[PDB]
A paper describes a structure:
In most cells, the bulk of ATP, the principal source of cellular energy, is synthesized by ATP synthase. This molecular generator couples ion flow across membranes with the addition of inorganic phosphate (Pi) to ADP thereby generating ATP. Like the analogous complexes in other kingdoms, it is based on two reversible motors, termed F1 and Fo, connected by central and peripheral stalks. In vivo, subunit ε is believed to change conformation in an ATP-dependent manner to prevent rotation of the complex thereby conserving ATP when its concentration is low.
Residue numbers in the entry:
A (entry chain J), N (entry chain I): 2 to 53
B (entry chain M), E (entry chain V), F (entry chain N), G (entry chain U), H (entry chain O), I (entry chain T), ...: 3 to 77
C (entry chain K): 46 to 127, 140 to 268
D (entry chain H): 1 to 69
């Protein structure tokens, strides 16, 4: 009879965006630990280890 | 003249070459269930009989097509 | 011709705007996704695109990122709901870009290094054993023409399915299954883009690595 | 990690003991990757060092001549 | 002229290419039951004979289709 | 005269030789799931039952074709 | 003019493409019974010969269809 | 008179005998994934389940053919 | 005009697609009998040759159908 | 009157019963790759995934046939 | 007008879809004979070559059907 | 009126149901080559890649049939 | 009007669905020869290459049928 | 889709992909090489400092 697009678009967009963004935010947001931990821990551990 | 060709072609084409999947699945399931059920004693009657329940699905496969044959004869 | 303006202007504006935007990100920085996108795309594309070696240098990442980001606009427009004024650019640009890019990339990449002697004189043991001249024309025409049929069939089927599903799903009556059926368009667009980029990069690296 | 006890017996006394989990050792058909939850499959172990985790994450390469899985 | 083509096409199409599934399932079940039943002695006659009961389902597969052939001749 | 041949040929061709894939897949899945599920005790009821979920796809295979049969009769 | 097409099409369609299941099942049963019967000595002649009894069912499979060919010629 | 035979024959031939590959592939993939996943539980967590992703290709195989059925009815 | 279509269609349909079961069964029986007969020495020539007797049944399977081809030509 | 039967029969016959090989090959390749990849974890990293490259040939199999469907509609 | 349809339909139907059994049996016999003949050295050339004699039966399978093609052209 | 039915029936019948053998052979060769290539490391890239050369024969199988489709359109 | 339907139906029916046996046999022989040839080193190149000679028979199987296609065009 | 589509679709995608990739190859390569240069510099500096 009608269309009912706000329920499907809002429920699908909010559910898929919140579930995919919240559940997939660790892979895209936690990926900086390799370069940050490798550069900071590598430079600090290499300079302190080479100096000591 | 379309009633004889339509009813005969509908009953023959609808209830003809269709039992190959059911007859092949019954022999394949019977051979696999017989080899797997006979290869072990404890598996002779504990879960292999559940495979016979798969035969109950045959009535919903090609055997249900025969139920439409009346549509080309009685209906 | 005054027709075909929304397809060329809308396709060239969205394709050139999203494709010609890598010149401003040369100085940085930009946010938290620069290290994950650059490290994941460079490490995954360079580590997963085995077969190049002595092929090229920036053509792998530039052709993969430019072809995926530039070609992703034709299949990522399935969410836009609402007559033969903005759908011919996807089917024409998909088959024309896949066939012209595969034929121009294979002929230009194969006719640059080595070379003119292997392609201009492909007889001897390859067409003299086998003394009849049918194996080189059939194998060379089928293997050299399989990229136009594969790229034209995959790009034409993906663009035709995305445009037909978007137009039929956006131009219907109810808004239940047509407005909520985004899994076939998202999975078909993502699988078509990943399969087209992986098949194009693997086919160009494998075809360019041996003569 | 540690899960099932994968003790090794030699010709005289015991060769190895302790629990094991993801034991990536080669089987009779070739290279395989077994872990915790495999069924009973009697295979053969030939020569070659196989890196398998022992206890508390002890990935040791146990190399021997003969072997019966 | 529709009685000859309707009855002949209905009997031939309804009782023609249909025994491939039953004949294939009988040979597959006989070979699998013969190999599995002959590979072990205790399994030679304890459960493998139950596989022969699967042959009883053949009468409800393609063999039942022949029962409709009379509809294209006697009926 | 096109309604009898079109409706009969559409119902017979659309709901005729199509159950061979579902009936063969049910017997193959039942035999393989019965042999693999009966060959091990711990695997008798832990993941093998998930194979029964594959039967739920049968309704989206040939069984859905019967849903079009009404188009050759009721519609 | 329906006697030639009905009799020829009925005899050829009813006694034509139907021996594939019996000919394939005979070769599959002969190969499986030969491999399983030859892999063991005691199983060479004790139960494997019973598989030959399955060949007796071939007369009730496609070979019976030839029995209907007379209906398109003698009857 | 070509609309009824062309639309009915196009919808029946285009949406008829086509589910044999999808239904057979679903049963073969379910049986192979059920036996392989049942023989090893460690691989029943992030390996055999990936085979279910292959089912996602079924929508681009025979299930897509049903999408053309509207061309013989709605279009 | 029914003699050319009935005789040609009867000889082609009766002596056409029918050698698939015999040719497939001969290759399957030859490969299985060759692998099983070659895997063991004592099983090389003691019972495996009996599988060749199964080839004698081929003359009563599809090869017999060619015997009906004369009915569409000489008779 | 040949445009409806030629276009409908060409689109349905050219894009109808053809996805059985691709859908069956996808399930067979998914089951074999799932069993081989599940039986060995070390081989599930840079070997079985290569089988997915075979899926790239599907576009050159029956999926290319759909590309001819426009010849029975748009062309 | 029956000579073109009878000769063309007889030559195409009699010499068309028939090489699937011979071509499939040649590949199955070649693969099984190659695996069984290559799995053992002594069995590489002592009995496996006898499987090649099975290829001699191919001339009596589908290859003989081509011998009837002249009946739709020269005769 | 014979150009539409002859060209459409020739292009659809000549380029229709033919990709089942190539698509099935590609999946069977990919699954067998993936299992055999993944079961052994040294055999992962020394002989199994030669199986990919078999794919080169696909262009001489059903893929060559598409080369005749132009005869039903361009020629 | 019989030249277009006879030549098109003869070329499409004689050069259409026929490459399934050759394409399936090439993939089965390539997968079996690749697995058996890759499972052993000494069997990698000593007898397995002889299986490639079986491919030479393909030219006498379905590939020879294309040789008759000229009879529906050039002759 | 009647006429004037091959020149616009082919020249737009070919000129946009070739002109965008040719002029964007040094920016994406130099701008994206910071992960490999920083990872190789940190790993080589840490391994060379520990080994030295």
């Amino acid at each position: 009879n009608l269309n009912a697009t706000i329920l499907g678009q809002a429920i699908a967009f909010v559910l898929f965006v919140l579930f995919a963004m919240k559940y997939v935010w660790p892979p895209l947001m936690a990926a900086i630990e390799k370069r940050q931990k490798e550069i900071a821990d590598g430079l600090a551990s290499a300079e302190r280890a080479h100096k000591d | 003249n379309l009633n004889m060709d339509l009813l005969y072609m509908a009953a023959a084409v609808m209830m003809g070459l269709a039992a190959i999947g059911a007859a092949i699945g019954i022999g394949i399931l019977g051979g696999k269930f017989l080899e797997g059920a006979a290869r072990q004693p404890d598996l002779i009657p504990l879960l292999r009989t559940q495979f016979f329940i798969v035969m109950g699905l045959v009535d919903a496969i090609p055997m249900i097509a025969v139920g439409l044959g009346l549509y080309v004869m009685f209906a | 011709m005054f027709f075909s303006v929304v397809l060329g202007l809308l396709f060239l504006v969205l394709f050139r705007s999203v494709a010609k935007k890598a010149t401003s990100g040369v100085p940085g920085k930009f946010q938290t996704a620069i290290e994950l996108v650059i490290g994941f795309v460079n490490g995954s594309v360079k580590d997963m695109y085995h077969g190049k070696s002595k092929l090229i240098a920036p053509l792998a990442l530039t052709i993969f990122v430019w072809v995926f980001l530039m070609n992703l606009m034709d299949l990522l427009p399935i969410d836009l709901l609402p007559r033969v004024v903005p759908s011919a650019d996807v089917n024409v640009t998909l088959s024309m870009a896949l066939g012209v890019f595969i034929l121009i990339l294979f002929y230009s990449i194969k006719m640059k290094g080595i070379g003119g002697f292997t392609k201009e004189l492909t007889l001897q043991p390859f067409n003299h054993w086998a003394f009849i001249p049918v194996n080189l024309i059939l194998e060379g025409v089928s293997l050299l023409s399989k990229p136009v049929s594969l790229g034209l069939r995959l790009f034409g089927n993906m663009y035709a399915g995305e445009l037909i599903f978007i137009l039929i799903a956006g131009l219907l009556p109810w808004w239940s299954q047509w407005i909520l059926n985004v899994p076939w368009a998202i999975f078909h667009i993502l699988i078509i883009t990943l399969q087209a980029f992986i098949f194009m990069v693997l086919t160009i690296v494998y075809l360019s690595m041996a003569s | 990690a540690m899960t099932y006890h994968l003790d090794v017996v030699s010709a005289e006394q015991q060769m190895f003991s302790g629990l094991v989990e993801k034991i990536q050792v080669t089987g009779s058909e070739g290279e395989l990757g077994i872990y915790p939850g495999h069924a009973p499959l009697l295979t053969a172990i030939k020569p070659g060092m196989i890196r398998i985790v022992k206890q508390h994450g002890h990935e040791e390469f146990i190399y021997l001549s003969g072997g019966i899985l």
